[PDB]
Every structure is written in structure tokens, then in C-alpha cells.
Curated annotation (Swiss-Prot), chain A:
The chain holds residues 313 to 363 of 364 of the full protein. Produces ATP from ADP in the presence of a proton gradient across the membrane. The gamma chain is believed to be important in regulating ATPase activity and the flow of protons through the CF(0) complex. It comes from the Eukaryota. The gene is ATPC. This is ATP synthase gamma chain, chloroplastic. Activation can be brought about by a ferredoxin-dependent reduction of the disulfide bond in the light. F-type ATPases have 2 components, CF(1) - the catalytic core - and CF(0) - the membrane proton channel. CF(1) has five subunits: alpha(3), beta(3), gamma(1), delta(1), epsilon(1). CF(0) has four main subunits: a, b, b' and c. Belongs to the ATPase gamma chain family. The lineage of its organism: Eukaryota, Viridiplantae, Streptophyta, Embryophyta, Tracheophyta. It is found in: Plastid, Chloroplast thylakoid membrane. Coiled coil: none annotated.
Swiss-Prot record, chain C:
It comes from Spinacia oleracea. The keyword Transferase does not apply. GO terms for cellular component: chloroplast thylakoid membrane; mitochondrion; proton-transporting ATP synthase complex. Transmembrane segments: none annotated. The lineage of its organism: Eukaryota, Viridiplantae, Streptophyta, Embryophyta, Tracheophyta. This is ATP synthase subunit beta, chloroplastic.
From Swiss-Prot, chain D:
InterPro entries: ATP_synth_asu-like_sf (IPR023366), ATP_synth_asu_C (IPR000793), ATP_synth_asu_C_sf (IPR038376), ATP_synth_F1_a_nt-bd_dom (IPR033732), ATP_synth_F1_asu (IPR005294), ATPase_a/bsu_AS (IPR020003), ATPase_F1/V1/A1_a/bsu_N (IPR004100), ATPase_F1/V1/A1_a/bsu_N_sf (IPR036121). Belongs to the ATPase alpha/beta chains family. This is ATP synthase subunit alpha, chloroplastic. SUPFAM superfamilies: C-terminal domain of alpha and beta subunits of F1 ATP synthase (SSF47917), N-terminal domain of alpha and beta subunits of F1 ATP synthase (SSF50615), P-loop containing nucleoside triphosphate hydrolases (SSF52540).
Amino acid sequence: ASELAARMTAMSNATDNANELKKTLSINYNRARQAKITGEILEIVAGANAC
Amino acid sequence: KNLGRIAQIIGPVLDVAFPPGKMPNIYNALIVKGRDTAGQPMNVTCEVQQLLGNNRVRAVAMSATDGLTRGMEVIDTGAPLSVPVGGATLGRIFNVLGEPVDNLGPVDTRTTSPIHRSAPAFTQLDTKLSIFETGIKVVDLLAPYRRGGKIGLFGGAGVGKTVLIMELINNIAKAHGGVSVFGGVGERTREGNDLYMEMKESGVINEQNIAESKVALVYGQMNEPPGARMRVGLTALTMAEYFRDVNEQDVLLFIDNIFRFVQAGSEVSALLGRMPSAVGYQPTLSTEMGSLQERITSTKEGSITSIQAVYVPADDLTDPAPATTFAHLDATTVLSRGLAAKGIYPAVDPLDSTSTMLQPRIVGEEHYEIAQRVKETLQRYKELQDIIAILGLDELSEEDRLTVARARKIERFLSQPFFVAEVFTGSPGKYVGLAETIRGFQLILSGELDSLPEQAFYLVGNIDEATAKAMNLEMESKL
Amino acid sequence: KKNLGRIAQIIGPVLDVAFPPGKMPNIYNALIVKGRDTAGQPMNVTCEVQQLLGNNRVRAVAMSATDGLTRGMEVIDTGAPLSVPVGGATLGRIFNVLGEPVDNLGPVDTRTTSPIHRSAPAFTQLDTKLSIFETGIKVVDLLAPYRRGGKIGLFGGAGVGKTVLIMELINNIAKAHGGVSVFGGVGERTREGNDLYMEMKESGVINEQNIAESKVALVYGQMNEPPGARMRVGLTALTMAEYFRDVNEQDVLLFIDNIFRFVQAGSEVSALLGRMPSAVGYQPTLSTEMGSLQERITSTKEGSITSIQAVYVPADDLTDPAPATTFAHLDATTVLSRGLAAKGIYPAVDPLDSTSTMLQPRIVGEEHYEIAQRVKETLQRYKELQDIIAILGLDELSEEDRLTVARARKIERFLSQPFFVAEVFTGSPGKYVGLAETIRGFQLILSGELDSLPEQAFYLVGNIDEATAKAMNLEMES
Amino acid sequence: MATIRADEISKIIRERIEGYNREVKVVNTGTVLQVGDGIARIHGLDEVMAGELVEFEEGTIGIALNLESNNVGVVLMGDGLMIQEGSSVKATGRIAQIPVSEAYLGRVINALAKPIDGRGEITASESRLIESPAPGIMSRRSVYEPLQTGLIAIDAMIPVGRGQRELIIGDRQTGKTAVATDTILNQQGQNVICVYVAIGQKASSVAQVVTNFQERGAMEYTIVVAETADSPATLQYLAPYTGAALAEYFMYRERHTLIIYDDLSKQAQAYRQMSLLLRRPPGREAYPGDVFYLHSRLLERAAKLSSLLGEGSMTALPIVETQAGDVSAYIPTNVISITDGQIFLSADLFNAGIRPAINVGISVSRVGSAAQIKAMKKVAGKLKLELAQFAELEAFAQFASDLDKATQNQLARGQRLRELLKQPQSAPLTVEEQVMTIYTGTNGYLDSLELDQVRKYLVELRTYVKTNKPEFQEIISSTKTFTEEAEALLKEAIQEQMERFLLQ
């Protein structure tokens, strides 16, 4: 029972750390979404002198 | 008589001043004759990009402009470039201009074919898809060809896409008795010289038996200009129409680097002042590769089986090159840089190379059912592998871990040796027939050699040879 | 009869000026409007003649603020690069970017003025010794041994206390280096510039009495500077430093910040100039500009140039082309983490991320680079361990894994030591931690001698003896 | 002609009024109509052929960038603060000549084919075209030769090829030039002309490695091509072509020869600044498209020539910079497209202590054992993918716990191999000593040995085999073949020094 409980507690704490790392990852993900948008903006900007 | 004055020189972009009425048509051949660095009159072959206007026109060069003072006279011949075609090429390493790269005898230029010729009719195509075998184990396992169709390789960097193509070239080229047609474009003179050497060694360049040669070479390597890198695919297509339209044979069309082939006019559109498209993209490059692929068609005359190959750009699949290429190719092969990271050579993208002829209607429900089970286990293996690297192989259930064994195994036994590979690999290559590995994968998902190792499955030819390697490694484990 | 061109066009500190059609001034020629304020004739528009536009007009970088500038105002061009009050006249003088006294001291002696658009020291002419420079700070001694005579930089995000670590560096090295010291506040929050002036006074590095014998000079362009003003402020600082390194031939203690802000200024300046901004915001000119910056910063044979500079490493993007472009040209970039200050380490350098040209067994001593590689790979293993540590936790880890983990944890904690002047935020009087006491502490820590001492006890603990006493306090605390 | 017609007004439109119903030629002198920052738009010089130098009236070599209609954009090689508006740049006509002989070898040449070293003007009487053409496939032989990296992991993993074209992707202070430096030290006995090209490096560090190369005497075998960052991007972007010209002088002098281009990523940003300096349409990270082609124009200059072309080995050594190793850079993407096989490093492993930090799975031999000696290509011939797979299983191991006899055995063999990869900084081996270690690990006789013992044990093995089996050194050397006489000698003195070191 001690093994069952400590496994359970480790997985619970892991789930907490998991959703934490998930939020950090998605934060950087949407940050990169802005980055891809910025590269698109750059491609837009060269056209402004081009056509 | 329509002489051009070389109006402005901006890279391969050339403003030309042909005369007012005598400004030529689109895709016009022109030749800026002038003093070379030799001082001899080098005539610069060039293509009419577009009418700038006012008797001046935008034109991509095929030669190098280094030495073009402005106003220089240019023979606007007017029409699409007529490649020396047919068996004249078969044996000749032609330039993109069709000039002999091979230091060969000059081609029979009576054979001559206009470059940007259009594409065929849906009526005019031959209409049955056929498994062109490979000698390549997991290739023929995972996906059958539509012979006469488009063999496509979305390629990693230095991928052995070269190597995969090369062993495939060896196998299918000895098999298919059509005149092979290798286009080495945007490529390495080391790699291309190896290709020419191994085509003579493959008897198909046939350095003695030139024009008994069952192959041609089109040369468009990356040292050529981007306008040179632009045009050469159509030149390959014109030779392709001469052998599959005109000579009407079941054509063999090695074609690469298609991503560099994109990349050139992709680079040249802003040189043309055609507006910025995507991340390197030219705008109507969609339509450009569409004319490429549509021109690459098995006519009713001949089956234009077409080894096409683009660099999958930095393994970005949504990158507009492979994005456009996805509808283009008939059977397609991403490789797996994971399997190259697994070290496989062939490193087939196991979930990610599909075929038109991948069907129980087509491959047989033997083959399709086998691959159904196979890719099923492979996919759930990739799935549960995440809970592996988080949760350890201890976390595995019974059939999951059996599948995991099956995964690492069928990975390894899916890897075969190419006799091409034998310097970068060093192994004897086995031209692996298809139903042999159908038996082996039936056995692998049957767990027969589950006794054996994936070390004993790593880069081998037969499931019997796999059990033999198991015998070898077992007796070595005795030692 | 210098050409008084009219003020042709004015948008931003790039003004166009119509010079004489014969007499256009040079590229990087200085200029001056006849000039006004409402209050009289403020003639203050000295200008850097950027681009010969033509039609007798040319675009130029005015070195000041542009208000009231009448289109058509006569700028007499100096026709020459701007000369600054170089040399020991500046020693004591907080010089403006204009060469004027930002100290509001007396107007300095104009005998040593200098063209800051100047040549670089030749590969023949450069000194070539790989001498290190002593630090007093923990990883600053250890991991990146700062090289004597070199542009040691610190790339860091904003709010690092790049201010703070630079000032503690100033505090140690200033008393330490008998070489001439030249600080360039460049776009700085001149509150901290005023702090720096107060501190030089407080150190006697402004020996206010014998202001000539201050022996440390200030060159400040505040945050409020315009960008063309912020453009060549470093060039003027380098010019007076070059008087120190060639004319005086003194050892050039030369700190400066912020070079990334200097790049940002040049970026917006070229945005004014009508040239296509190449990178994310950066000018195309950024490359050879920062190269020219680092190229005057060559440690000359007459005076080697220990040039501590700083990169405001923006957005934590090392791959920002500013910090990327910098990472070549610096000799030793202390990479300051934001994260170790979220761990509370002041200084927060990711010593893993910094790198020394001086890092060699042949250079640092084989003992030093041996224990250094030991601690470095301890860090590397710790960072690799962090991945599995994150979700799963260390109960799935091994006991050698936990051994290495607490070991490198101890290494990281002992890497935290206070800094000397750093108290004004925190309160701690720092230890000028010498290299060998650090070496013994590394020996104890990685050797697991300190593996009975506590990790929290090693936090901001200078010596391993000081750690031993701090641990004695903790072990006393019960 | 919005730019030209503005400043045409004073002279050139006054000339246009002067010569309207008249068709003229000012076709030699580009009076420097517009000019900005190394880029000029000189009115005239229309008969200047493309690629020519342009003798600026003040004295500067305007590099031929783009012929616009009225003026032309020209790239100033020099500091053109001298030139006034409308300066009649004569067209200097010589289109990218290059004073080329062996004269610059033993001299740190500046980018102008002048010595940066102050060893005086290299009397290099030939004029190889700086923008040279490239080695054709017919002009190529296959690179049959092996090149001596000395980095035994490298020549173990990726065969260095005489003529071949490898690129080293790296990290901010990979110190990747030091790997090149020891390669030059390996090249210092290799009868190869050597070039140390240097784009925008720390000229301090350039002098550091220059002193190290002079002290090495690879600087006898080497010229140093040098253009530090403060110079013109004309010079910076272009200088690779100059090194290629010197190389082709040595390579049409048929020699084994090898070049070391210190980052062209610097030159990539330089030509990026050239493109925006042209005010042209730039692209991915402000590169033009053509830079890749220009890289290609850089790259495929270096090949194993045919014997018709003299079998001249022009081996290439690029070290492309990379932001934190981000291969998706169009710089890195074009380079990945370019060099036939490439050296990915991972300075994590340098921070882990592998100095060299060869990112083995990521580093690539497109060539393979063709550029290995048949001794080595036999001996460690199946060892590269073996170390890869040992890494692969050890990768598949930390997920698991109970390492089986096959599993822990391969893990022992691989951890042994990883320590067996660890050659110290400038601890080059003979390929005799290299393949000696390879036969030690290949016969597995140190899979027994612990890695703490195995480092010095391989060292003592190397020294004993230097003494006891110099015959085997000349066997693996002379036969180029790890014969069973030689491999038996290897196993023989392996048992011998195994006794001598278990003794230790």
C-alpha cells in the first residue's frame, strides 16, 4: 500500500508539473506564433518597396 | 534581324532592348554575343522572362553575365529552346543548353525540341497504375509504385536521398529497359561524377557503347546560374517527351534537385521583380511546379516513370515546396531524419511515405492487411513512446511492450543495405525482393524472430538472413 | 570658406543639407547649423555627414536634437570627422558625446581633440599576449577568465543589473587596474549614471580634488539621447580611450554599455536614413559598424585595451542578430542569465553559457581548466538532469544521479557569492573572491568534501572557508 | 530614374539638354552620380563590362554590382569618404583579377591579395580570376584519396577527403577554427598547400591562431587569407572567391591542397548588407536568393580534379556559424544543401567535455570510406554506425533499468567507445595510432577496461605501439591495409601493453 500511495503521489505531483510545463510550452508556442507572424510581416515589408 | 541591346544588367535579370516591333515572344531564346574574358564572342543564351515594355524586356540569363557591358547585341531567336533530344542525349551528358558536358561527340541537333512545351491531356495519358519494384525492402513494403508515374522524394539534407535514388536507379534501371534519363541538377559534381561513373559502371552511360547506352544525362548542377537552374527541368521534360511522347518508351526520368529547381526562380522572382511570395517562394511557383508535374505524365505513348526529388526544406513539410509537391507526386517518400537519427539507411519515413498504388485493390489485401497491422503497431509505438520517455519501459503493458519489441525490431529489419551504400555504409547490399520482406514482416508482426535481436535485425536482407544473423550474434555471445 | 549648405530637408536627426554643388562635405564630415533656439542662436547642430545624396544635397546625422530647425538654415560643414576632447582632459571630465563637459566642469583643454571616425589597430600593430585579468568575482575569475587587454563583454537581458554586475566589476577592477579607466554610459538610465559619478567621486576615481588626477573618465549619453547622438558616443569614448592607449599608451580599462542599445540607435538611425532595415529591426549597416566598434577596440601594443562592454541582450534572443553579431566580435562574453536571478544568484551568469578565449589548461593552468571542466560538465549534467527532474522528480533518478545533482547543485550555490558594491539593493558586503580560494572551493565541492556542507549555506558564500563558517552558523542554528 | 534625374539636373540633365537629338557615349567614366556608403550610382561607364573593377577618381576599386540604365550601382572596395559627388570612376576593366602564384603561401595575405602580415607584397605574377568558374564533373575525378584530419573521431566518423567539401556547423566558441588549426597541423605533414581563410574573426584571435600556426609551421604550408569585420563587405563577401583563386592556382598546380574558410555566415550577413546596400529586394534574414548560389559559386570551386584536370585535390573546410545550431536558417539550409557531407558539432558536448564535440549522428559523411585508408576503411569501417547504434541503444536505455547482458554489454562497448572517442585538444593520432585504437575497440579488448584506466591505457598502448610495433606502423602506413600481419601485430602488442598496463 505504501508503494501504491507513493506512486500515486508522484504521478499527481508529476501531473501538476506537467500542466505547468504545458503552460510554459504553449506560452512559448504562441510566442513563436507571433514570431512566424513577424516573419510574414517582414515578407510583407519587402513587397512595399517591391510592388 | 531582331538584335537586342542589353539595356540593364541586374543579376540574371536583363533588361534588353530588342527593336520596337521586333521584340520577341515569351520564353524566347536570345544570344548576347560579345567579347568574353577570352575576348571571343560568347553568345549568352537567355530566355525572355517578361515584357518590361517599351521595346525593353525582362529576360533571365542562362549563361553568366560577367562581362556584359550594356547595350550589347542579343540574337532574340524568339522561341523556346530546342534541346537536342532522343537517343542523341542517350549517352550525352547535355548541359542545360544541351551542350555536351560529357566532352562527347556533339548530339544530333536535328533532334530538337522546344523547351516550355505544354502538358498533356487527361485523355492522352495511359491509365493503369503499376507496382514498379525496387529491390529496396521497406520501400516496396510500405508503398508500391505507380509505374509510369511520379516517384517523389521529399529530401533531407545530404540525406542519402541521393543514395536511395541511386540504388533504386541501379535496380529499376537494369530492370526497366527504357533509356534511363538522369538529371543531376543543383547538385554536387562529386555526387554527379559518381553518378556518371556508376552509370557507365551500370552499363547505362556505356562509355564504350555510347548510344547503345540505355541512359542520358542532363546536367544542371548548383555551380550553374539560377536562370540555368531555372530552365533545366523543362529541358529534362523535353527529352522526356522525346522518349515517352516521341520515342514512346516506358521512360525513366531521374529528376533532382527539385527544391533547388524551385529555389532558383524562387530566387529569381524578386530578381524579376515578381513580388515576394512565401519564405523563399516565388508567387506562381505553384503553377510552375504544376506545369512540371503535369508535364511529367505517362502518356498513352510511353510510361514516363519519373524519379523526382526535392529537398524537403529543413524537414519543414508545410514549407511551400513540398506543400506544392504533395499533390504533384504519385508515390512519395519523405525520409525520416528520426530513422536517420535511428541511423537507418534506408531511413524511410515509416508512417510518412504514401502511394497511389497503396491499396488492397492495388497491392492486395495480403499486402495492405500486412501493412495495416504493421503501421498500426508502428503508430501506436510512436504513440506510447511518449509515455515511454516520460514513464519508462517499466510502465509498459504486455502487448504494448511486445509491440515495442516489434517496433525496434521491424524498424531494424525494415532497414536494408544498398550495394550503392558500401562506402558510406561498408556493407554488402542485397537487392531485397518484395515478397521476401512481406514474409519477414508477416513474421515480425507474427513475433517469429521475436527471439532474435533488433541488433540481429539491423540492416539485413532476409528474415532467413535475419535468423542467420541471430545465429551469428548468438554464437558471438557465446564467445 | 567652409560650405554653409542650407538645411535642405529635416526628418529625424537625419537632416538633408544642400551643400555647395562643388563643395559637398566628406562622408562622416562634421557640420554645424548656424543654428538657433528661441533663446538666441543655439548653433549646436554638429552633424555626421552620412550619405552624399547629390543634387548638392546630402543626408547627415545631426549630433543633437532637431527642434526649430528651419528648412534652409545654413550649416557650415566642418568637412571633417568630429574631434573630441581626447586624453587626460577627459580624465576627470564627464564628457558629453559632443566632447563637451557633461560634468559641467570647466571646458576641457582642446589641445587633444580627435577624429573618432578613425583607423583600427593593425594585426601587425596589435599586441598578442593571452594574459588573463584578475576579477575577484566567482565565475568571473573562474569560468570565463577575463583576458587582459581585450573587449570582455557581458551579454544580458534587461533588468539583469548589467548595471549592477558592471558596477561591481567597476568597483573591483577600478581600484585594481592602475590602467586608465574610461566608462561609457551609452543610452544609460542616467540616474545610474549619476550614481556612477557619485561613485567615482566616492572612490577617488573621480579624485575631485586634482580633477586631472581622477584617472577615470566618464562619457555619458543618457537614455534621453537621440539615436544619432547615441550613434557615435561610443566612437568618441573609443577615441579618448585611443588617446589613452596610444597617446598615453596606458592600459585601457574601458567599460561601456549598452552596445545593443548602440545597435538599436543605429537601427532607428538608418530607419531615418532611408535605408532598408535588414534584420528584425536592425540596419544593414549593423555588421560593419559593430565590427568597426570592435576594431578600434583592438588591444594595441602601446596600450592594450581591456574593454569591458555590455550587450543589452534583448528579448533573451541570443539569435537576435544584435547578440549573434556581437558573439563573434567580443573576446569573452559573460552570458548573464535572467534565470539565475529567479534563482536569486547575484550575479546571475549562466556560466555554462559564457565562454572564454582564455579557457585553456595551457592558459588557465591545467589544474584550473581541469577543475573548471569538471564543474562545467557538472553543470551540463545538471541541466540534462533537469529535464527528467522536471515532470518526474528525482525519486525516479539514480543515486549517482542524485549525487551529481546535489553536487552540481552545490556547485551552483557556491558559484553564488556576493559582489562588492552590490549592497545598495541587497545589503551584503561582497568578497573579492580570489581565483585560488575559488579553486579550493571548487575542489571541495566537486570532490564532495563540501558534500556535508549545505547547499543553502553555500548560497552567496564567498570562500569555502566562508562557506564553512556559514555552514557552521547553520549547523549552529538549531 | 527617380534617383538619377534628381542629380542629373546639375550636370547630366544639363548634358541631356546638351545632347538630346544626339546619341552619345560616356561609356567609360561613371561620374559618381549617386553614392552611398560603398554603394555608388555612377552615371555613365556603360561600356564597363559586368564584373569589372572601376577605378574611382579618388582611387578606389568599385566592384561591379548592377548596371542600371542611367547610373550603375557599384560596390566600393575601400573607404570612399575620399570620393566626391560625380567623381569619374574610370572603369578599371580587369574583371576580378587575382595576383596569384604560390607567393602568398607563408604570408597572411590581406583581402586585396596584399599581405596583411607585413611580409611585403607577395610577388604572385599570375592573375587567376577571383570570380573563378568551377570544377566540372567531367573535370572531376572522384575523390579517391583520403585526407588526414587527425581528428580520429572525424576520420572515424566522416572521412576527410582530398578535394572534398565538408562544412563544420558549430557554436559560439566552438573554437571550431582550432579544429581547423590542428587539421592544418595534420596538413603540415601532408604535402598539401594550406589556406587559412578568415572572414570577420577577432583579428586578435586571428593573430592568436596566426601565431599558433606560425609556431605550428602549418603557416609554412598555409597562406592566411584575412579580411576582418571592419573592412568592406565587398572584401568580406567576395574574399572567398579570392581564396578559391589561390586554391585553384595550387590546384591547377595539381597539388593536394586544402582551405579553411572561417565563417562565411559572417560573409552571408556581409552580402546581406551588400544586397540591402544595393537597396535590392532581400529575403530570408535579408539574404538575397543568390547568396546560396554565391555560396555554390563558393563551394563547388573545390573538387578532386580529373587527371585530365591534373587530379588536383582542392579540399574544402568550411566552418559555418549557426545561431545555437539552428539548422532551419536559410544560411544553414543552403549550407546543408551545399557541402557534400558536413560536420555538425554540439558544444553541449564541449560543455560535457568532448573537445572535439562532434555531433556524431548529426555530422554527416556523404562521401564515406572512399576517403578513408583501406586500413582504416577496413578497420573501423563498420564502427561509425556502430558507435551511432551504441549511442542509439544507450539512448533507448535510460528509459529502462535492468540492463541485459546484450544491453549492458553494448553499453559497456559504447561507453568505452565514447571515452575512446576522447582525443584531447590537439591530441592528433597517426592513422596508425588512430586505427590502432580502432582495432583495440574493434577487437573489444578494452571493453574489459574501465574508461578511467582506458584513457591512459590507450595512451600507453599508443606509446608502446610506437616503440614495439613501428613495423606495424609502417604496415598500416605502407600497405594502407590493416593486414592480419598488422592486425595480428596490433593484437600482439595489444596483449603486450595490456600486460604492461594491467601491470600499471
